[PDB]
Amino acid sequence: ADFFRIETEIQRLDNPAGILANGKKCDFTGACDPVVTAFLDLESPLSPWPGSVAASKWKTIFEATDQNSPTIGRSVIRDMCGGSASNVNLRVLVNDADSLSSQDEIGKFSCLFQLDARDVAMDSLSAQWGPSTECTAEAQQGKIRLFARRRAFEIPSTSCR
Ligand SMILES: [Zn+2]
Ligand SMILES: [Zn+2]
Ligand SMILES: [Zn+2]
Ligand SMILES: [Zn+2]
Ligand SMILES: [Zn+2]
């Protein structure tokens, strides 16, 4: 397919200890205040975090106060127009809201998804969501966890943004 939509979903964050990537408690309370930014990387999906485009340019997808393990259920959508792509990386940064610039992040996650022919449905109604997939973290792997899933489907060229 040369014109298709990639839909990814940040399903949830699970941080039962209430800790940052350096292993210390959020705000030294363990009462984390997650701010989730994200970017769907089609140009450098196999490169080190953060890929093609710096996290400073990412849009905010979700905020909560005093939620260690929030349900998120928010989508990050990009179109591939005029040709093929074989993978895409949903890059996610989670900070605590407090001392944004200074406190270590909660996490740096890479949700790498394949886009083989079988992964791109002929249309949105026949698209199947892939399974809930644990994103790869720079630190605290299996202690601070992010879950995402993707679907993809052909769209008319005139709707390909
Ligand atoms: Zn072609
Ligand atoms: Zn949990
Ligand atoms: Zn969902
Ligand atoms: Zn905080
Ligand atoms: Zn760090």
Distance 160 CA to ligand 4 centre (A): 39
Is 33 among the annotated ligand-binding positions? yes
Q: What is the resolution of this structure in A?
A: 1.6
Distance 30 CA to ligand 3 centre (A): 26
Amino acid at position 129, single letter: W
CA distance 66 to 49: 27
In angstroms, what is the C-alpha Rg of the chain? 16
Q: What is the 3-state secondary structure (H, E, C) of 92-153?
A: EEEEECCCCCCCCCCEEEEEEEECCHHHCECCCCCCCCCCCEECEECCCCCCCEEEEEEEEE
CA atoms within 13 A on the CB side of 110: 20
Whole-Å CA distances, 155 to 5, 79, 121: 7, 9, 10
* DSSP 8-class letter at 67: -
Q: Name which of 1, 2, 3, 7 is nearest 152 in CA terms.
A: 7
Q: Are 116 and 86 in contact (CB under 8 A)?
A: yes
Task: Report the structure determination method.
Answer: X-ray
* Phi, psi for residue 54 in degrees, rounded to 5: -65, 145
Asked if the peptide bond before residue 45 counts as cis, ω within 30 degrees of 0, the response is no
Distance 11 CA to ligand 2 centre (A): 13
For 16-27, b/e burial (b = at least 16 CB within 10 A) is: eebbbbeeeebb
Distance 2 CA to ligand 1 centre (A): 5
Which domains are delineated in the chain?
A: 3-159 (2.60.40.3510)
* Phi, psi for residue 84 in degrees, rounded to 5: -95, 160
The DSSP bridge pattern shows strands 34-41 and 71-81 to be: unpaired
CA distance 37 to 95: 8
The DSSP string of 20-59 is -TTSSBGGGTT---EEEEEEEESSSTTSSTT-SS-GGGPE
Distance 106 CA to ligand 5 centre (A): 8
SS3 85: coil
Q: Are 10 and 36 in contact (CB under 8 A)?
A: yes
Is 2 among the annotated ligand-binding positions? yes
